[PDB]
Amino acid sequence: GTVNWSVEDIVKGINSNNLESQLQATQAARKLLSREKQPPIDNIIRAGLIPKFVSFLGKTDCSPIQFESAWALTNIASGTSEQTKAVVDGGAIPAFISLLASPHAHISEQAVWALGNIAGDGSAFRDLVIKHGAIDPLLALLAVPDLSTLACGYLRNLTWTLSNLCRNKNPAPPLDAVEQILPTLVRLLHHNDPEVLADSCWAISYLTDGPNERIEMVVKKGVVPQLVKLLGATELPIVTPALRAIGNIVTGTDEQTQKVIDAGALAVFPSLLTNPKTNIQKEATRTMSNITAGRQDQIQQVVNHGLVPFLVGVLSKADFKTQKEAARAITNYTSGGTVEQIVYLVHCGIIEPLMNLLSAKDTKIIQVILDAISNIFQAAEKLGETEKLSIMIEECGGLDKIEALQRHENESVYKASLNLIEKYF
DSSP states (O other), X not given: OOSSOOHHHHHHHHTSSOHHHHHHHHHHHHHHHTOSSOOOHHHHHHTTHHHHHHHHHTOTTOHHHHHHHHHHHHHHHTSOHHHHHHHHHTTHHHHHHHHTTOSOHHHHHHHHHHHHHHHHHOXXXXXXXXXXXXXXXXXXXXXXXXXXGSOHHHHHHHHHHHHXXXXXXXXOOOXXXXXXXXXXXXXXXXXXXXXXXXXXXXXXXXXXXXXXXXXXXXXXXXXXXXXXXXXXXXXXXXXXXXXHXXXXXXXSOHHHHHHHHHTTGGGGHHHHTTOSXXXXXXXXXXXXXXXXXXOHHHHHHHHHTTOHHHHHHHHHSSOHHHHHHHHHHHHHHHHHSOHHHHHHHHHTTOHHHHHHGGGOSOHHHHHHHHHHHHHHHHHHHTTTOHHHHHHHHXXXXXXXXXXXXXXXXXXXXXXXXXXXXXXXX
8 A cells, every 4th residue: 555665656645735645655655764674764865855754744634644754754863863964954853842742642752752863863963952942841741640651662762762862972961951851760760661760770871971060960869779779680771771870970979989889789799790791790890990999998898798709700700801890990999998908808819810810911901900919018018928928929920920021012011010029029
């Protein structure tokens, strides 16, 4: 019926003076733009059809052509940036915002998904969508006493579109818009659908990926305990953004980092630091390295939760990028820790796997490991136990590796290497 039309036939119908013929052809356009293999988006754009689709968005008297053109436009705007720009340049943004008020749920849903695709393309279109007024009508679609009375697909699409309005930097979204959306996000973060929860966590992770004032807007709304709960979810699409958000929050102040600790986050890290998905392990170890760069009482809480062995574990055997983050976590720990805390670190077995990593290609990890070694010796000096430590390092191949590093391309590597050797060997 409307199956496998040519662009030429689509054009001939859309240019007829016949609203039913126009509807037929708009639907044929939607079906073309919907096919899995290589939809002819650019042919459709080249034919000049975007303006005609956009004009059909306003035919309130013919809601099916509103729907078909909204869905055709949506498949264009989900493409490449130039394709999305063709939709924006056709005037689609305010036409879609108007359709958020449609009494046809399936039409306003299409308008939600179209605006998510436009806003997601980047910061400028994100802010343009906001400037045309999309936030109020979007949030009004969620102003119901129980989100569970909304259709599942519809709620998922609203959540996803809201997260794209939270997305991207340079610049980050307008402060007034974030404050407007955050209360709804907080509510979505307590909805029991795994996808709503994933996308809510993604939104929070974007908002926390910034300076400490942005983090504070989020932490003030009280979401950290819920984020930590979601950190323990079974569904990886939830854990991944929950962990990204928590990882972001601990790049902030000590007081913001403390909320994460107070909320119980550290009790999940035994699993996170052994997780079979390499990105979860990397991200969890980076989060640990930010925490070990905090106050001594915060280092102590890493200690008390039994996490130092897990860091020894990750340093010993992990993806190389994860071993690198774990090396940072140890250097931070030894820079900021008490002597007693550094003793404990050595007793858990950090020295051997530290040494074994000195034979790595990365110049930066070598710098990091050498710093930590120096910090450990500085703790040994305060106990006059440098000798017992030099033996340890001599006993697990450590000393061979350091002698060799005096002859190293980088300056800082040469210097620190030969310094340690003269000072303690």
